[PDB]
Amino acid sequence: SITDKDHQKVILVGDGAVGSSYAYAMVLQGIAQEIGIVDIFKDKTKGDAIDLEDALPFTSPKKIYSAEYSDAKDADLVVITAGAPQKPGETRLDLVNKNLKILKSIVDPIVDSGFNGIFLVAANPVDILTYATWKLSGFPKNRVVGSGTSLDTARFRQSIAKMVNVDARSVHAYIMGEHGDTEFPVWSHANIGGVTIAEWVKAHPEIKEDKLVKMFEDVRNKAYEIIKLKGATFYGIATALARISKAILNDENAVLPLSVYMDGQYGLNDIYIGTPAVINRNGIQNILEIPLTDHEEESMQKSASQLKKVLTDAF
Amino acid sequence: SITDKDHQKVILVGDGAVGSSYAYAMVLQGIAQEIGIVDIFKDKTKGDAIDLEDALPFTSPKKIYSAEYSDAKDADLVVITANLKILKSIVDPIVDSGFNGIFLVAANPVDILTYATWKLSGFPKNRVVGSGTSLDTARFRQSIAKMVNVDARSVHAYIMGEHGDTEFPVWSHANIGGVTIAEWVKAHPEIKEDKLVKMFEDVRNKAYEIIKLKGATFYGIATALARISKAILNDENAVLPLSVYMDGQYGLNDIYIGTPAVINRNGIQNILEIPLTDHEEESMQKSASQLKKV
Amino acid sequence: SITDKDHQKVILVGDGAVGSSYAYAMVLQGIAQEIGIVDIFKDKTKGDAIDLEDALPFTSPKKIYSAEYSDAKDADLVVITAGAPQKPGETRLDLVNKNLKILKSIVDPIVDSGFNGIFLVAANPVDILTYATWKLSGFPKNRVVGSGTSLDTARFRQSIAKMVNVDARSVHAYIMGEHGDTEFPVWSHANIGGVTIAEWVKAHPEIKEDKLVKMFEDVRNKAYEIIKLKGATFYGIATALARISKAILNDENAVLPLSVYMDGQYGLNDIYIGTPAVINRNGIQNILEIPLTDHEEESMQKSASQLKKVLTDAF
Amino acid sequence: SITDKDHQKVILVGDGAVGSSYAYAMVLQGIAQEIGIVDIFKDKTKGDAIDLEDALPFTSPKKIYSAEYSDAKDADLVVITANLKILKSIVDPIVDSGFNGIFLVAANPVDILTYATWKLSGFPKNRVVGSGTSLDTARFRQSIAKMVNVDARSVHAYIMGEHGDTEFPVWSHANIGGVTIAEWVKAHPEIKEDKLVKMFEDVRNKAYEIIKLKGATFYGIATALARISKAILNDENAVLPLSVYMDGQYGLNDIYIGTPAVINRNGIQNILEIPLTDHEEESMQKSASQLKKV
């Protein structure tokens, strides 16, 4: 039967707080039918798998288990989460190189298993590791996807939502560029129920320019704030990963801000970087090129340039 | 216990295709815990209630029954789908029951009957809500979504004004994932201006086309009513295009007309005044004028 | 990419109140990504498709359209709903024969399209037409499924639920046999949260035997009551069909009372009849054989015997 | 408006792995509209609240914040996960706030601390609920589901008694789609009695195994707490195994212990007394005895 294929299988690589929280999100939302969890720390993955299985009688059924790279053979999705952290005083290039070795030891056995689905990359630095996964795997550009600025965009939406007291699902505003210190807000096309932020501020002049600038700064620094407060961030990114997973596995043609391959968009080439894109069961369909102001376009060029320099030195 | 209040009750007035379909939507999506169905045809409402109850083992539980206006005493929401003298015969007994929630009006002509429900009921402006152009807006979004092959949930565009022949599209603020339609056409010039014109004309005539094909429209509006119901009952502060009372917005006063608004458990919280182009503003003024005259 | 298959497609044959309501249930619950609606009345199917599409912006996306049998080529599921109604004074055998001709004109072009999924049969008489679909299609027994007594079982559960004031999801009780006048309740294994009905009645002696007997009678006659009141029944069966569809398309291994092929169970052979079964993406896995009391087993034998006689005369 | 009440508020006490995970579950499933998180470690609760808020654009909206006991004034539900003197320092200020909803107790030893919360709070018996053997029951169901390759939602089996080493399986009423385990083994004799014994022993030791492997258990109980929370807030009259007050059931009095019960917006509505075999009843008596003595 053609309906022998109606079994969606996800292989998760990295079972830190991000990977674990992602698996839990997929369990609670009933997304996919099978999750294999791969990590060097085997005991932890078994522990997580059996803790997660106990949730199953209150949600939809799944097979969940501690897995190996060879289990990716018939997977739909390989989700790569756990980047080696930057050490005090280590360069960005050194961070990249140590992650490339590790990432090679994940991607090569996954490819060798016969895996032929979509790579979803969340490991930091995400735009760089998305590109690296593309280079290592040999896959088509549109089947290697990074989480990019999807989380920063959610943070930005929720911050605006709180300021104006509106459901963030009615707020539409992007953060773009390389996820990290060089990302920028796209204020020119940001809106609340279709009303641009510029228009909203005209109607509500108590909202000062200084507060909007600070709101974006606070978004850019949000991970640092959360890490300072509780040690690590995870609920945001796990949720954003589950959302991306659903867009793929339910073939949605949803627009999400993701790390996608530049082929001329924004005057950029041959890097992965954060922009809105349409995603479906076959990966990235269209890349949306928001017409940026001169100030926004310069931010995009600066973000990309430093990123491209690091990629060039790295490969 | 304060938790004795965690029981949400809807009274539906009118059990035609629209009302029936709305009840089904509420059942399937697990919205509210109690639905009473009020209509002159008592046998039908009983038939519907018991057919609907049969869906409940595959969803979350509810109390569903054939109801009378007096059952609105402790309802959260009265949804009117059942037409001017008829409305007075519904609203007066609902008010007389002690009902003290939110009126959601879907009966046609909706903007007029929303106003009329406000006048008859004596309720505050923000607690009498009409479905307005929420359905035309969904039609418009889905039509754009099909043209560009994108989830409609990523298309943002409004139809505004009076629901009916004088409604208009707000192209100036319409977008797909934040990229305005004018910007999208520049990037995708196979999309001709004439197709966009036609798209809106097809949205405006869509009820007529559906009626011609199968006799009546109901899945669209049922679904829009359920969505509005969820925004209220889950206190969302969602932005939806609804029939709301004009107190200066767009230069208008003392009518209910379609515009985006924030809605929550207490009804309308903010009315969004989209800055319209001169052409869009004239369309709004003309739609409102003719409506106000009636 | 293997994730080119993550697009679930349902072809609905019959766009009466049952088929239409089913399509609406699938839209609201976000089940499957594509519904093609096939009916002799083409205008009605176009009308329904476009009315349904207007719901899409408040739920998950789908392709919905007026379809033809050839569109079943790559479908997961073909759902057959609209049986020709029994006319006053027409025999049951005549009802069967006129439905067989029509059903042949559906099943042969579906098979000829290359369809290779699962047939879900809801058209009345359902157990007979499930068997007939099996005979006509050539498919394996476990990929031709009828709705059977899933709806009667829901009616029974909800009636008990109302009597005792408990969520019907906590009530577990079956109606079995041929869906229709010969079906019977399985009181011996019926329970509320694990407490059998016999045990519940001991604890709550206000519940009289006469009331339980009447409750089952009222379930058996429920369609007649609904038809007398509003002309037709549809919300019950549409919901039960969507539930079965979800069990298949999400590979649940759920237990549902369905019309399934007897290979010795209950002392029966070579008929489709209603019993609990496990269903998943490949159709019927296990058939559950509830150990019936002598009275319940005799009801099952009588239901099956008359059914088998009609099938024999018909083929 | 009566609809001003359509806003459900939870106060969570204890923001360790269990409490954090529960908040995440409530967020993802769209249960309640407001979560305040109370813990001695204020920086952590703020860190969690803002990490959680970042999930809200992909789900339904909520207010989520670092909270204090005084915020329980108008809560629907107080969920205690944070341990005997500690409990008095939580319950007294919650009661003093004016809180008047339902206590859901998950802290270990749960049956004891549920009783203690009842004693300290002065609340009615049916409005102090413990998670009891809801998690052990889920473990048991999933373990059977895996053995037979059936959705656990179609497996019905209970663990009862005090949550902990004296709990026991109710094999006499356990079933898979209505077919008792004794009946299933007759049809499937590759399933040995020894495997069933082991299965229960593995359920009883499961927390220990999980702790050994990853240090702490949390997804199971979080999920069970969210399910109980939904049963209350959506007024379900669902049957769940919970810690409930014994008033004669199973020959027991004046303790909280695990048994199936009906729960709705007002808390416990009926306690189900499963007719146990002599062996199962003795297990219940022994579990209760030792508990009562403590």
Cα B10 to Cα A256, B31, B76, C29, D81: the distances in Å are 36, 10, 6, 21, 35
**Two structure tokens written together for C302:** 């009588």
Do the Cβ atoms of B177 and A253 come within 8 Å? Answer: no
Cα D239 to Cα C6, C67, C92, D57, D283: the distances in Å are 36, 44, 43, 33, 22
B156 is catalytic: no
Which one-letter amino acid corresponds to residue A70?
Answer: S
Q: Look at residue A281 and give its three-state secondary structure.
A: coil
Q: Residue A143: phi, psi to the nearest 5?
A: -110, 15
CB B263 within 8 A of CB B250: no
Q: How far apart are CA D4 and CA D53, in angstroms?
A: 23
Tokens 């990302």, residue located = A183
Q: Closest Cα to residue A291, out of A302, A281, A276?
A: A276
Count of CA atoms in the C-beta half-sphere (13 A) of D282: 2
Interface contact B100, partner D, CB < 8 A: yes
Q: How far apart are CA C85 and CA C105, in angstroms?
A: 17
Cα B188 to Cα B90, C288, C298: the distances in Å are 51, 57, 70
Sign of the alpha-carbon torsion through C115, C116, C120, C123 = positive
Distance from CA of D2 to the nearest CA of C (A): 26
The secondary structure of residue A177, as a DSSP letter, is B
Do the Cβ atoms of B1 and D77 come within 8 Å? Answer: no
Q: How many residues does chain D have?
A: 294
Query: D192-198, long-range: CB within 8 Å, 24+ apart, which pairs?
Result: D195/D147, D196/D171
> Per residue in A137-158, is it b (16+ CB within 10 Å) or e — as a string?
bebebbbbbbbbbbbbbbbbbb
Closest Cβ–Cβ partner in B158, B236, B237 for A194: B158
CB B135 within 8 A of CB B206: no
Q: How far apart are CA A52 and CA A46, in angstroms?
A: 10
Element holding A293 (H helix, E strand): none
**Two structure tokens written together for B118:** 């406000």
Best of B4, B8, B103, B234 to mutate (most D CBs within 10 Å, chain D) = B234
Measured at the CA of A236, the angle between CA A104 and CA A244, to 5 degrees, comes to 60
Closest Cβ–Cβ partner in D24, D48, D152 for A56: D152
CB A58 within 8 A of CB D223: yes
Closest Cβ–Cβ partner in B24, B57, B138 for C54: B138
Measured at the CA of D85, the angle between CA D82 and CA D87, to 5 degrees, comes to 40
Q: How far apart are CA A246 and CA A237, in angstroms?
A: 14
Do the Cβ atoms of B176 and A254 come within 8 Å? Answer: no
SS3 content of chain D, % helix, strand, coil (to 5): 50, 20, 30
Label the pairing between strands D168-169 and D175-176: unpaired
Element holding D264 (H helix, E strand): strand D253-264
The two most distant CA atoms of chain C are separated, in Å, by 63
Q: Closest Cα to residue D262, out of D242, D248, D245?
A: D242
Q: How far apart are CA D172 and CA D154, in angstroms?
A: 17
The secondary structure of residue A85, as a DSSP letter, is P
Distance from CA of D59 to the nearest CA of C (A): 13
CB C279 within 8 A of CB C145: yes
**Two structure tokens written together for C138:** 């050539």
Sign of the alpha-carbon torsion through C129, C131, C137, C140 = positive
* D-proximal residues of A, 253-282, CB under 8 Å: none
Q: How far apart are CA C158 and CA C154, in angstroms?
A: 6
Closest Cβ–Cβ partner in A165, A199, A278 for B150: A278
Q: Closest Cα to residue C174, out of C141, C199, C152?
A: C152
Label the pairing between strands D253-264 and D238-247: antiparallel
CB D249 within 8 A of CB D152: no
Cα C13 to Cα B215, C20, C45, C65: the distances in Å are 20, 10, 10, 12
* B-proximal residues of C, 134-193, CB under 8 Å: 151, 154-155, 157-158, 161-162, 167-169, 171
Q: How far apart are CA D44 and CA D39, in angstroms?
A: 8
Q: How far apart are CA D97 and CA D125, in angstroms?
A: 20
* A-proximal residues of C, 60-99, CB under 8 Å: 60-61, 74-77
Distance from CA of A178 to the nearest CA of B (A): 19
CB D219 within 8 A of CB D23: no
Q: How far apart are CA C257 and CA C197, in angstroms?
A: 19
Q: How far apart are CA A21 and CA C53, in angstroms?
A: 35
Q: What is the DSSP string of A216-265?
A: HHHHHTHHHHHHHHHS---HHHHHHHHHHHHHHHTT--EEEEEEEEEESG
Q: Residue C38: phi, psi to the nearest 5?
A: -115, 125
Q: How far apart are CA C203 and CA B216, in angstroms?
A: 51
The chain B residue lying nearest A169, using CA atoms, is B238
Q: Indicate which residue of C172, C179, C189, C204 is catalytic.
A: C179
Element holding A95 (H helix, E strand): helix A92-112
**Two structure tokens written together for C211:** 């009331």
Q: Indicate which residue of B7, B156, B163, B188 is catalytic.
A: B163
Distance from CA of C169 to the nearest CA of D (A): 8
Q: Look at residue A47 and give its three-state secondary structure.
A: helix
Q: How far apart are CA C36 and CA C11, in angstroms?
A: 5
Do the Cβ atoms of D43 and A229 come within 8 Å? Answer: yes
Q: How far apart are CA B143 and CA C192, in angstroms?
A: 48
| Reported structure resolution in angstroms | 2.0
Q: How far apart are CA D85 and CA B159, in angstroms?
A: 61
The chain B residue lying nearest C226, using CA atoms, is B47
The secondary structure of residue A76, as a DSSP letter, is S
Element holding D61 (H helix, E strand): none
Number of CB atoms found within 10 A of residue D198's CB: 12
**Two structure tokens written together for C255:** 């237990």
Q: Say which residues have a Cβ less than 8 Å from residue A53's Cβ, sequence separation at least 6.
A: A64, D142, D146
Q: How far apart are CA B163 and CA B154, in angstroms?
A: 23
Q: How far apart are CA A50 and CA A64, in angstroms?
A: 8
For residue A229, list its beta bridge partners: none
The chain D residue lying nearest C171, using CA atoms, is D239
Q: Is B202 exposed, middle or buried (0-12, 13-18, 19+ CB in 10 A)?
A: middle
**Two structure tokens written together for A291:** 């017409």
Distance from CA of B223 to the nearest CA of A (A): 18
Question: What is the separation of C-alpha D265 from the centre of its chain, rounded to a whole number of angstroms?
Answer: 16
Measured at the CA of A206, the angle between CA A202 and CA A210, to 5 degrees, comes to 90
Q: Indicate which residue of A172, A179, A204, A295 is catalytic.
A: A179
Cβ-based contacts under 8 A for chains A and B:
89
CB A261 within 8 A of CB A134: yes
Question: What is the separation of C-alpha C241 from the centre of its chain, rounded to a whole number of angstroms?
Answer: 6
Question: What is the separation of C-alpha C269 from the centre of its chain, rounded to a whole number of angstroms?
Answer: 20
Q: How far apart are CA A123 and CA D191, in angstroms?
A: 44
Which one-letter amino acid corresponds to residue B14?
Answer: G
CB A151 within 8 A of CB A263: no
Q: At what angle do helices C222-230 and B42-53 cross, to 10 degrees?
A: 140
Tokens 């959302």, residue located = A243
Q: Closest Cα to residue C27, out of B152, A8, A279, A244?
A: B152
- Chain A residues with CB under 8 Å of C29 CB are none
* B-proximal residues of D, 215-254, CB under 8 Å: 232-237
- Chain D residues with CB under 8 Å of C288 CB are 176-179
B-contacting chains (≥3 CB pairs under 8 Å): A, C, D
The chain D residue lying nearest B5, using CA atoms, is D5
Do the Cβ atoms of D29 and A24 come within 8 Å? Answer: no
Q: How far apart are CA D2 and CA B9, in angstroms?
A: 11
Do the Cβ atoms of B76 and D2 come within 8 Å? Answer: yes
Query: Which domains are assigned to chain C?
Result: 1-148 (3.40.50.720), 149-315 (3.90.110.10)
Q: Closest Cα to residue B45, out of C16, C232, C228, C229?
A: C229
Q: Say which residues have a Cβ less than 8 Å from residue C41's Cβ, sequence separation at least 6.
A: C15
Q: Closest Cα to residue C190, out of C277, C274, C302, C290?
A: C290
The chain D residue lying nearest A256, using CA atoms, is D58
Secondary structure of chain C in HEC code, one letter for each residue:
CCCCCCCCEEEEECCCHHHHHHHHHHHHHCCCCEEEEECCCHHHHHHHHHHHHCCHHHCCCCEEEECCHHHHHHCCEEEECCCCCCCCCCCHHHHHHHHHHHHHHHHHHHHHCCCCCEEEECCCCHHHHHHHHHHHHCCCHHHEEECCCHHHHHHHHHHHHHHHCCCHHHEECCEEECCCCCCEECHHHCEECCEEHHHHHHHCCCCCHHHHHHHHHHHHCHHHHHHHHHCCCCHHHHHHHHHHHHHHHCCCCEEEEEEEEEECHHHCEEEEEEEEEEEECCEEEEECCCCCCHHHHHHHHHHHHHHHHHHHHHC
**Two structure tokens written together for C309:** 């006689």
Count of CA atoms in the C-beta half-sphere (13 A) of A72: 26
Secondary structure of chain B in HEC code, one letter for each residue:
CHHHHCCCEEEEECCCHHHHHHHHHHHHHCCCCEEEEECCCHHHHHHHHHHHHCCHHHCCCCEEEECCHHHHHHCCEEEECCCHHHHHHHHHHHHHCCCCCEEEECCCCHHHHHHHHHHHHCCCHHHEEECCCHHHHHHHHHHHHHHHCCCHHHEECCEEECCCCCCEECHHHCEECCEEHHHHHHHCCCCCHHHHHHHHHHHHCHHHHHHHHHCCCCHHHHHHHHHHHHHHHCCCCEEEEEEEEEECHHHCEEEEEEEEEEEECCEEEEECCCCCCHHHHHHHHHHHHHHHHC
What's the N-to-C CA distance of chain D in angstroms?
A: 49
Sign of the alpha-carbon torsion through D140, D143, D147, D149 = positive
Q: What is the DSSP string of D80-117?
A: E---HHHHHHHHHHHHHTT--SEEEE-SSSHHHHHHHH
Q: How far apart are CA D286 and CA D276, in angstroms?
A: 14
Closest Cβ–Cβ partner in A172, A192, A255 for B150: A255
Just list the catalytic residues of D.
163
